[PDB]
């Protein structure tokens, strides 16, 4: 219908050459086709909703799904092998979307196609690799969306993938911390013993409470960096992108497109248009290349942020460390995971001490306290290294210059 | 294009027209950096200045295209040496305070750069640098009055009934004379040159007929400003007085903490070192008063013998002695 | 880490708070008074998760995951008349043994211990009707007879019966010294369990409740049915990051790993800014964050003589940008007094206003909540002790605390009272001792 | 920066009522705080922020904190402007009915609730970032005004030691209560001389005189007199609210006006004004009439009123050459002391763009704050009454409250110290008039 209409329109002008009203018809046709292609993308192929179910899977703007997923996948991920079933993960995903707020999408009459695109892929790290670090989620887009929405294209930078891994770090820390918190609350609350016990038990209780406080310091720092990311980088750039995608919804009149250069010099882009000057007497939407530019701008803005930029010479390094900020932060997260490992070992051996002294009251296998004290020295040394690294990272941020980095550092202290 | 509004915003940025509070805000947020190092020191980290400016611009009105385009810059040439490229003045006779190197500029967007040429933009920029120097020394004397009337060390009644005069009373009298001179120079300039040219330009675009006529009025206003005596002939003596007032504000910020060691309020302790300090302050204060009086008589004599408004007579009335 | 939460309502005040809490949760999810979704079938897109606090029967009807229990059936019956068919009458339980023989802890704990089978069968029936279970929500009113006794036996059973799940009682505390003897007795007796068995517990003060209700309600006819309103508001804002999932805090386990550093410091203090969830004046989000530290906004006895905040957690609801939140926290980090042994800080959480709530005019863009783990929470407990000890040394009312007890002796019951008092003393000891920077040096230097 | 108004007393809150009605007229705010301007534009010509707070509703809240001992006057104000003021700033504490119009009553109402009032002040400052100083509106005759303003000055001279404490003090005309009125006057003047940074002084005699000789109502209703104080404060702060090239802070104004922290009592003058025979009073005529003793708001009428500092604020269509001719005339006319400079500072201010030129109002209007040698003549009545009554017929049975209550000796000592500091102020003014002020300063060098 559109082709017939505009072919008639142009053939009715074929005699005037390439005139100005030929350009009028060009403008009308451009507006119409771009409006309709946006409307088709949204209403017929769930463009907006796939953008959202992208921010809510690979950017983790919905934590219920990720917690349910990671629960159901504890049995598979925790196997530190590549010889995983890799097909039980299908059911893991089915039951995750089942046991989240995304069951309102997998059971939606029209939007089920949105959630049927979510699939997982495993990385390649070699033999002995851990199912926790090979595992990644993904989104499988076919045309038309695969043309407009940039996702882990087989030759792109896979920015969604690296973002998912960087936040999978935080999510693994959260899972292990909450599991260990429940185990430790069980351990401590199990000391409903008559104070006539040997003082070793009271010493255990005090030591375990102080270990709990140090673990809490760890987990607070972890959750703090996680919140900072998913609220000031992901959420911020996503709100920017969503503002862009609905720009015709009467936004603030920041019409002045300024060009800013690395030398500080700025200038308006092109020509200053007049304030709707009239002498004689319809949305402005975005086309395909413009939508893909918006999505790539969102993803770049997220990966250009200082706490994501890695592997180039354009990086500014944080003084008092001499390193790029993301290297420091990933070192902090690795130390966090090593701490949760030693702390789970400590909780296990504490359960052992308790159940052995409940079997034989200080009468058998008291030598567990040697391993207990060695693990105590280990966890306190690691906490000390942790606080050192935290002070290093705070000094890094405080001397960068950006206001938000200064404020993050101060909030971290 | 609402060129009236564009000129209004350009006069708010570079002339100070109806925008004194913005300049005061800029100074208070940036009072420390514009006096630091007396220069850009080894490409000093004056990027913090740019960051402050961009932070303020983020809170600026979005419909004000000119302040969105305002670029704070640090030019490697002092305001007098920049003026020496057009007028018969003389350069410094050493690094000199950072506000003397501070400047602004706008890449006026097409077509607005047809009327608002680069020549009138350079005139705007030099005028703004001069206005910033004046308002900066006025803010210096404001905060000096503040420290002289909010620090109990200075309000304290005492000082041997002799030290009080030769130190505090001479200080307050010289500070009052400095304040009257600076505020009177700024009054004369702002409301007898800047205001006159703003009013002339405003008269021009009341039903004009030629774009070249509007350009001519704009450039003639900025030339009347840049060729005005207090911007083109009194520049060296104004610089002298500016150095004197800056040294005196340094003296006051120092005495703020170094005066609590003189009267019993210091509770060596009122030993002969205290009297040595007292005599040194008497000598330095007499030095400041003498150099100020000499340069001020110089200023008055350069005023009377030259030729034109009666704002000059107001300046005389302010600075001439009994 | 994540799952569903059973809501156990025990005692008259607990059940009143429960009625208001379920009315609220219905308002924030369009569930109606009967469990019938008021949402038209034209909008099948839900961004929330009622599943944690409602069971969705295949009949498109939500039964609230609750077990209403009591001894005086009239209040639960009235609730069921107000929520017609909403709760499952197969969850209710009254034991039909008559009115309680007094308002003491002994009656509650005895009606609990005589029907432990019925109670644990109800709770097992509610758990097998789900898959992923995380914890409980007990509404308590610690200083009542029913409240104290039922909550005490409940905590005793569920400390080891479901020994992986995060139990949390929501204990309301009275204000008056009229019947202070029996009420403080019950308070200490049940605090034994709110310290011994529970994994978490929030506290409110009827004094500050009455004060803030008199302030915000333009009615000197302040009924406790208007303070259960604020209690439910606090519970709603606490569980908002569960009933409307978002970036950070999915479930209770996470918010507690943030809030409760060690199992001893587990009493929490609410604070809430002007709000419309009940029957305007305007501010910003910066104003909300600043008013969150107002003594006249906190719901527990403040006594803010330089209080020590060990863990603060904000919840901001509505149209809010992290810029004003960052600036407000920049102001409040140099204002709130945090003990120097901690290098952590305040946990802010930006939450989504319920899409089903009435579209608010932007005069009241934002609303907020603050949970705080501060040492000055024990001031509600000191008033209980400073009566219990003096009336217990004289043996007042020690006869009503032997009902069905295995210790029918006066002496051993006095011993149990003194043991619970020693537990509360240990609580206050740990609260005041955490203020000492050498608290962690038990491990940090003692190598 | 930011300036929080502080109204203490019945006179203080009347000044606040008329002042805020005026300031709301000038910025088109109305009586509810909602801008009477169409939101079609996002560009404003003024800076309301130094005196008004902006909430998320785009309503303007006057940064004021109203104080009183009888909630009747504050309730009258808050009912006149329904929804304008934020009631979380109003404070009376209802600490019973005042036991007389005694300075000790207000001073004790302050000493017993310093916690509450400083918490309110801290809260209102928390709604700002660049805070500059306070405006303390209060009379000096009454008990509430005098005592509460004295305690406010004592608390804010140190609780906020880097801010400008401005007082706009209305002094009384000789009334039947002359004894207690003069006692409160000297008691409060102790603090006005010791703590305030700048004190504008209004004499009720000249205020009533001018109000009668302008208003058509022959009976001088003191509420009508209040409009002159309101106009003076508006004119002072007009260089800040509607900014211009020169004076964007009260710091600059006072540094121009105040030589030392011993001569800081400013004598306002204004001409002309018409309220709810034009002659058009051209700007030269206005600048000349500014020095006519018939326009001063403090009765001086002296043949040698030595002006130390002068600062005129001309508002409207001002012709600078007229200003310069008038300055020539005045530099010939005005008697400046032979030890200081002869500069009269003219700040050519702006008229409110949202305030239309009212019929029978002048094209130009000017205000003068001057630091004369004879503002102490406002204090002579009080000092004479105090020295001729406190000697034998003391009324000190009313001033025994709080710590002063602990002994009549305490009240006697405080009255003596206050009279001593007032005498010190008068010695300062009479001394700085002589040429010998700088002899032993610069000549003996
Ligand atoms: N929020 C709220 N609290 C209440 C209400 N009624 C009583 N309370 C509080 O609950 C305490 C009493 O506990 P209850 O739950 O009534 O238990 P009880 O004392 O044994 O009373 P019964 O249920 O009649 O046996 C009182 O001290 C009150 O502080 C109410 O209606 N609403
Ligand atoms: N301009 C003006 N002056 C007033 C006003 N009210 C009182 N005064 C003057 O202030 C003097 C007394 O001070 P008040 O303001 O009445 O204070 P007060 O006497 O302590 O009375 P309370 O504040 O009620 O305790 C009177 O002699 C009046 O001259 C007023 O509303 N406007």
Residue numbers in the entry:
A (entry chain H): 424 to 704, 715 to 846
B (entry chain G): 413 to 505, 552 to 725, 751 to 791, 801 to 814
C (entry chain D): 1 to 279, 286 to 453
D (entry chain C): 3 to 278, 285 to 453
From the study:
Microtubule (MT) nucleation is regulated by the γ-tubulin ring complex (γTuRC), conserved from yeast to humans. In budding yeast, homologues of the grip-containing proteins (GCPs) GCP2 and GCP3 (Spc97p and Spc98p) and two copies of γ–tubulin (Tub4p) form a 300 kDa complex (γTuSC). Spc110p, a distant pericentrin homologue, recruits this complex to the nuclear face of the spindle pole body (SPB), while Spc72p recruits it to the cytoplasmic face. In yeast, the CM1 motif is required for seven identical γTuSCs to helically assemble into a γTuRC at the SPB.
To validate this hypothesis, γ-tubulin was engineered with disulfides to stabilize a closed MT-like conformation (γTuRCSS), resulting in significantly enhanced MT nucleation. Realizing that this would require much higher resolution of Spc110p-γTuSC interactions, we focused on obtaining higher resolution structures of the ‘open’ (γTuRCWT) and disulfide trapped ‘closed’ (γTuRCSS) filaments containing Spc110p by collecting new datasets on a direct electron detector and incorporating symmetry expansion and 3D classification into the data processing pipeline. Indeed, the difference map revealed clear density extending from the NCC to a helical density that spans the inter-γTuSC interface and beyond. Based on the side-chain features, we were able to unambiguously assign CM1117-141 to the helical inter-γTuSC density. Interestingly, a pair of helix-dipole/hydrogen bond interactions augment binding of the CM1 helix with Spc98p, with Spc98pD542 hydrogen bonding with the N-terminus of the Spc110pCM1 helix, and Spc110pK120 hydrogen bonding with the C-terminus of helix Spc98pH19. During the transition from the assembled open γTuRCWT to the engineered γTuRCSS closed conformation, the γ-tubulins on Spc97p and Spc98p slide past each other in roughly opposite directions, undergoing translations of ~6.9 Å and ~7.7 Å, respectively. Strikingly, our γTuRCSS structure reveals a cluster of phosphorylation sites, with many exhibiting in vivo phenotypes, that maps near the Spc110p:γTuSC interface in the Spc110pNCC region and near the loop connecting Spc110pNCC and Spc110pCM1.
